[PDB]
Amino acid sequence: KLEFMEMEKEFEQIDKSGSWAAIYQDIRHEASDFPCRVAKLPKNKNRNRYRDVSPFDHSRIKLHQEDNDYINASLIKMEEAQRSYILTQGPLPNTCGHFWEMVWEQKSRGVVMLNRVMEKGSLKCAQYWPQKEEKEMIFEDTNLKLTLISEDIKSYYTVRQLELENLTTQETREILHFHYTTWPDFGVPESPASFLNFLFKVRESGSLSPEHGPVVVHCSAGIGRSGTFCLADTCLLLMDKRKDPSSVDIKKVLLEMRKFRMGLIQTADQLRFSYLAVIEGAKFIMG
Numbered sequence: 001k002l003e004f005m006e007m008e009k010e011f012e013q014i015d016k017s018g019s020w021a022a023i024y025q026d027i028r029h030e031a032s033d034f035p036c037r038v039a040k041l042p043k044n045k046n047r048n049r050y051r052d053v054s055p056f057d058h059s060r061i062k063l064h065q066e067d068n069d070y071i072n073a074s075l076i077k078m079e080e081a082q083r084s085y086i087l088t089q090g091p092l093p094n095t096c097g098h099f100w101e102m103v104w105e106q107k108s109r110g111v112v113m114l115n116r117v118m119e120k121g122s123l124k125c126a127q128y129w130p131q132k133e134e135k136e137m138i139f140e141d142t143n144l145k146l147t148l149i150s151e152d153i154k155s156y157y158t159v160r161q162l163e164l165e166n167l168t169t170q171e172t173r174e175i176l177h178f179h180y181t182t183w184p185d186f187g188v189p190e191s192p193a194s195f196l197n198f199l200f201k202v203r204e205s206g207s208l209s210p211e212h213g214p215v216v217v218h219c220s221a222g223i224g225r226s227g228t229f230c231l232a233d234t235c236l237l238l239m240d241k242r243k244d245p246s247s248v249d250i251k252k253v254l255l256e257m258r259k260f261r262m263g264l265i266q267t268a269d270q271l272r273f274s275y276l277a278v279i280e281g282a283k284f285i286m287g
């Protein structure tokens with residue numbers, strides 16, 4: 001089955017004819033448009049990192065808390081691939097509590113962070129997890145306690161073991177934190193290999209299994225890097241479940257995803273990268 005020699009030549013083709021921008025732009029202007037009335041209510045202003053990025057009302061995550069149920073987060077549900085993800089923004093100083101509250105209510109087992117607390121000057125994200133085992137964090141508002149249990153730092157990413165405790169029901173759960181540290185805003189990963197490696201680590205940890213709630217994925221705004229990550233994972237699942245990998249149309253898959261959250265994948269290059277990553281990854285799995 002040198003059927004991959006076709007996908008790869010197809011890639012070199014698009015690459016050759018410099019058609020990536022066209023393909024990407026076409027997707028942008030075909031993407032779904034849905035209302036985001038809740039995100040725009042005056043009371044939720046300070047809960048949004050960015051003015052022009054909001055969760056659609058139909059797929060937004062609702063906090064089971066009584067007061068205000070809003071958080072800038074979206075549930076992406078892929079039927080065929082049979083995987084779900086929650087994409088959200090880098091927590092704000094006033095929303096770290098809400099963030100971990102969502103992780104608890106949705107029963108997530110993993111958190112995937114693709115940005116850095118500080119990016120190109122000025123911290124583009126709050127330090128929502130403990131950096132020192134001995135300095136756990138307590139979130140007054142949502143009444144949760146979080147403790148760093150251990151962490152394995154590597155060259156382009158860090159894996160952390162955390163303990164999240166609901167101080168009301170006195171229950172505790174182990175949350176795995178996968179932080180990819182070398183992915184610039186509006187840029188691509190250091191390399192396809194690093195990316196796939198980080199992704200396989202997330203997969204084998206079982207954090208993506210249907211046993212748990214959906215994995216929480218975020219970057220700064222929760223659309224560029226987060227969209228690339230999920231698009232790649234989902235497309236890899238489809239190439240394995242389809243009797244014919246070539247049948248996977250990444251353009252359609254992204255559009256499908258864009259029905260749940262606006263602007264997933266922010267540059268023609270990220271789209272290209274996700275393609276490269278999917279082919280390399282498939283070749284590896286089907287070995």
Ligand SMILES: O=P(O)(O)c1cccc(-c2ccc(C[C@@](Cc3ccc(C(F)(F)P(=O)(O)O)cc3)(c3ccccc3)n3nnc4ccccc43)cc2)c1
Pocket residue numbers: 050051052053115185186219220221222223224225226262263266
């Ligand atoms: O207007 P539409 O409806 O056609 C539409 C549809 C979909 C997306 C957008 C849409 C797409 C991009 C933006 C850029 C952004 C937020 C944003 C930040 C990082 C990332 C990221 F990619 F790096 P990450 O990886 O973290 O996701 C993605 C988005 C912004 C850009 C640069 C710096 C600060 C803010 N921003 N938000 N509000 C703004 C007001 C004035 C100027 C810039 C603004 C806005 C809307 C617009």
Ligand SMILES: [Cl-]
Pocket residue numbers: 028262263264265266
């Ligand atoms: Cl867009």
